[PDB]
């Protein structure tokens, strides 16, 4: 229960703001969009501020009309058909309230991914609900699809949004001058005890650990084990064990473990070297808006090296506003023009951004090397880069068997980018380098999920997780085996797993064989996709066992679980379940779909997919 800030409307009145942009974000994408819209206000004679709804009480929206030409914008992401954690309060409020929002003007931009049944559910709800409550829409709902290109969807919406705002309120495009949000303050003689060295919350919080641990106060768990899971050399799949003893962290199979990684030191050093900057300068970036709660873009004071290493994202392709602001620092005309045009909503500038930056997966260093005239000051770059996010992993262990250890099953990311270089996954490269052996510590925390084994030990379980999708099921199988050892009555436990070849990347091969031998796994159905000319996938095995699965589903009350790739595997497995139901019900495809979607609402078809 966070302590709410005082009314955001009064803050707007006291600081001359007429527009406030709220963000529902978990990976920081909606947060950036909000900040971008907020900063935009200035270019149209208005003044905005972005804000975390969790820190506020949206009921004060009814007071917003008290400000002339006032407006509120919501940039909301959706997660599993639900609101972001930080937007749950606001969501619950929209449902319970009956407050009259007459006079309130709003606009909504939703961040979603079409590869989901509930595409932009949050953005759609917020947009619809504010209207039901009496507020009037000032611009159409935005539907950003992260499966195509979200950045482009924002550009398009934004380009139309402002002219519509200006026309309704009768304001002009007062043109654009580079404006810093922070001021640099170099520190020449500061006590080392006050310089952030990578911690996420309070100073020295990593050195002096105190519970409870969470996203703002992660627990530095020792890496007790880090072994290679795959047999061959095509790729690198690994199994790590994080010791959470004395952390008091609670967890259950199905939960996720998040880790705060460190960027590649070489990459950090090269960025500093190409900019001719001294990365060991101790400094702070202080907000020019002395009223804002966001005093720095990241924990300060600190060195540029530490910022680029633990607080800043220096690997993902930079967004258009970043390249736009950096353009001023490119001394070669043609290069200044290419960067400037990256923010176009159409044409060659847009196409170049999509192919040369996004498709080629060029990170900031690559751009600095490919456009050699671009030499921005390090301090402004640090202000522009997005924050380094934590990465989530499906805990591969059962707390009933390993209450003081959190297991991770992950594939190391390393690929040839069309940018011509080899790109390395931040968290996995970092995880892979951690050696059991001070100790190898990993800053982490647990996030509870709704992916859970049936409450009743007798309820049948059908698990589908090819590749790394196996990771929560190792926890499930462990727990189910443990239940049998405790004398309990355990229903059928079926695993449908898949890999390329039994001698290449069959994860947990020995463990799964043991569980099967001992009866913990009623069936171990493995699809080896490359051992023959045609592909053999998990859904092929499900179709093969359609008769039995239907019996378990329709008569046994079986629970279905699907983990892994959400792009193709999940949809294909879902389609196969449609076919099974349709044939054995029997019923028309349309009803089969409803039947399966119903199982999802009744908690009997759960997902843990990602891209």
Ligand X SMILES: Cc1cc2nc3c(=O)[nH]c(=O)nc-3n(C[C@H](O)[C@H](O)[C@H](O)COP(=O)(O)OP(=O)(O)OC[C@H]3O[C@@H](n4cnc5c(N)ncnc54)[C@H](O)[C@@H]3O)c2cc1C
Residue nearest to ligand X (CB): 425
Question: In this structure, what DSSP letter does residue 312 have?
Answer: B
Phi, psi of 143 (to 5 degrees): -120, 80
Residues 454-473 close enough to bind ligand X by CB under 6 A: 468, 471
Q: Radius of gyration over alpha carbons of the chain, in Å?
A: 26
Q: Is the peptide bond before 447 cis (omega within 30 degrees of 0)?
A: no
111 is annotated as contributing to ligand binding: yes
Distance CA 345, CA 264 (A): 33
Q: Which x/- pattern over 254-273 shows residues binding ligand X (rule: CB under 6 A)?
A: --x-----------------
Q: Is residue 236 within the footprint of ligand NAP (CB under 6 A)? A: no
Residue 413 is a binding residue for ligand X (CB under 6 A): yes
Cβ closest to ligand NAP, residue 386 vs residue 469: 469
User: Which run of H or of E encompasses 528?
Assistant: strand 523-528
Tokens of 222: 């020792």
Q: Which does 530 bind (CB under 5 to 8 A by kind): ligand NAP, ligand FMN, ligand X, none?
A: ligand NAP
Q: Of ligand X, ligand NAP, ligand FMN, none, which one sits near residue 415, judging by CB under 5 to 8 A according to partner kind?
A: ligand X
Q: Which residue is nearest to ligand NAP (CB)?
A: 467
| Known catalytic membership, residue 563 | yes
Element (H, E) at 324: helix 320-326
Element (H, E) at 256: strand 256-259
Q: Name residues contacting ligand X, limited to 289-318 (CB under 6 A).
A: 315
Residue 462 sits at φ, ψ, to 5 deg, of -115, 110
Q: Does the footprint of ligand NAP cover residue 293 (CB under 6 A)?
A: no
Distance CA 106, CA 60 (A): 14
Catalytically annotated residue among 52, 550, 563, 606: 563
Taking CB under 6 A as the rule, does residue 29 contact ligand X? Answer: no
Rounded distance between C-alpha atoms, residue 34 and residue 150, angstroms: 14
Q: Is 565 among the residues that bind ligand NAP (CB under 6 A)?
A: yes
| CB nearer ligand FMN, residue 28 or residue 556 | 28
- The residue range among 158-166, 296-304, 407-415, 586-594 that interacts with ligand X, by the rule CB under 6 A, is 407-415
Region binding ligand X by CB under 6 A among candidate stretches 220-228, 330-338, 408-416, 594-602: 408-416
E runs forming strands in 265-358: 282-287, 302-303
The one catalytic residue in 247, 394, 399, 606 is: 394
Do the annotations mark residue 536 as ligand-binding? yes
Neighbouring residues of 409: CB distance < 8 A, sequence distance ≥ 6? 229, 237, 238, 239, 393, 394, 396, 468, 470, 471, 474, 507, 508
Active site residue 264: no
Length of the chain in residues, anyone? 611
**Number of Cβ within a 10 Å radius of residue 568:** 12
- 425 labeled binding residue: yes
Report the nearest approach of ligand NAP to the CB of residue 504 (Å): 10
The CA–CA distances, whole Å, from 417 to 71, 263, 424 equal: 42, 18, 10
Residues in contact with ligand FMN by the rule CB under 6 A: 25-30, 77-81, 84, 111-113, 116, 118-121, 146, 150, 610
Beta bridge partners of 463: 495, 561
Residues that bind ligand NAP (CB under 6 A): 411, 466-468, 498-500, 529-530, 535, 537-539, 564-565, 568-569, 572
Binding residues for NADP(+): 235, 468, 529-530, 535-539, 572
Active site members = 394, 563, 608, 610
Residues that bind ligand X (CB under 6 A): 256, 315, 361, 391-394, 409-411, 413, 415, 425-428, 468, 471, 610
């Amino acid at each position: 229960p966070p302590v709410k800030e005082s009314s955001f409307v009064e803050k707007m009145k006291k600081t001359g703001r007429n527009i406030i942009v709220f963000y529902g974000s978990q990976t920081g994408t909606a947060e950036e969009f909000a900040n971008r819209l907020s900063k935009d206000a200035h270019r149209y004679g208005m003044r905005g501020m972005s804000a975390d709804p969790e820190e506020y009480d949206l009921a004060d929206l009814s007071s917003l009309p008290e400000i002339d030409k006032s407006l509120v914008v919501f940039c909301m992401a959706t997660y599993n058909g639900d609101p972001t954690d930080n937007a749950q309060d606001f969501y619950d409020w929209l449902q319970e309230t009956d407050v009259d929002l007459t006079g309130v003007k709003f606009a909504v931009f939703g961040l979603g991914n079409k590869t989901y049944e509930h595409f932009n559910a949050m953005g759609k709800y917020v947009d619809q609900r504010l209207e039901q409550l009496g507020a009037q829409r000032i611009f159409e709902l935005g539907l950003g699809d992260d499966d195509g290109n979200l950045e482009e969807d924002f550009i398009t919406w934004r380009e139309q949004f402002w002219p519509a705002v200006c026309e309704f309120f009768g304001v002009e495009a007062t043109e654009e001058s580079s404006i810093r949000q922070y001021e640099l303050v170099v520190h020449e003689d500061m006590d080392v005890a006050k310089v952030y060295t990578g911690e996420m919350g309070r100073l020295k919080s990593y050195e002096n650990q105190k519970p409870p641990f969470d996203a703002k106060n992660p627990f530095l768990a020792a890496v007790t084990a880090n072994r290679k899971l795959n047999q061959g050399t095509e790729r690198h799949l690994m199994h790590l064990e994080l010791d959470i003893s004395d952390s008091k962290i609670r967890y259950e199979s199905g939960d996720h473990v998040a880790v705060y990684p460190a960027n590649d030191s070489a990459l950090v050093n090269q960025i500093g070297e190409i900019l001719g900057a001294d990365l060991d300068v101790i400094m702070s970036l202080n907000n020019l808006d002395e009223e804002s709660n966001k005093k720095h873009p990241f924990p300060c004071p600190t060195t540029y090296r530490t910022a680029l290493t633990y607080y800043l994202d220096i690997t993902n392709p930079p967004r258009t506003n970043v390249l736009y602001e950096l353009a001023q620092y490119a001394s070669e005309p043609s290069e200044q023009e290419h960067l400037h045009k990256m923010a176009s909503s159409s044409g060659e500038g847009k196409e170049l951004y999509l192919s040369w930056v996004v498709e080629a997966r060029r990170h900031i260093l690559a751009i600095l090397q490919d456009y050699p005239s671009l030499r921005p000051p390090i301090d402004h770059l640090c202000e522009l880069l997005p924050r380094l996010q934590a990465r989530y992993y499906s805990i591969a262990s059962s707390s009933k068997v390993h209450p003081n250890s959190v297991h991770i099953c992950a594939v190391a990311v390393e690929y040839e980018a069309k940018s011509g270089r080899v790109n390395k996954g931040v968290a996995t490269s970092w995880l892979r380098a951690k050696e059991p052996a001070g100790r190898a510590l990993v800053p982490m925390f647990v996030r509870k999920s709704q992916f859970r084994l049936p409450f009743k030990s007798t309820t049948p379980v059908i698990m589908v997780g090819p590749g790394t999708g196996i990771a929560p099921f190792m926890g499930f199988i462990q727990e189910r085996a443990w239940l049998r050892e405790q004398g309990k009555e355990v229903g059928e436990t079926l695993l449908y797993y898949g890999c390329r070849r039994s001698d290449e990347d069959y994860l947990y091969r020995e463990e799964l064989a043991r569980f099967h031998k001992d009866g913990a796994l009623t069936q171990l159905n493995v699809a080896f996709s490359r051992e023959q000319a045609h592909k053999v996938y998990v859904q092929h095995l499900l179709k093969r066992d359609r008769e039995h699965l239907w019996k378990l589903i329709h008569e046994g009350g079986a629970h279905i679980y699907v983990c892994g790739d959400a792009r193709n595997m999940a949809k294909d497995v879902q389609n196969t379940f449609y076919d099974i139901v349709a044939e054995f019900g029997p019923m028309e495809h349309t009803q089969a779909v409803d039947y399966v979607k119903k199982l999802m609402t009744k908690g009997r078809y759960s997902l843990d997919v990602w891209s």
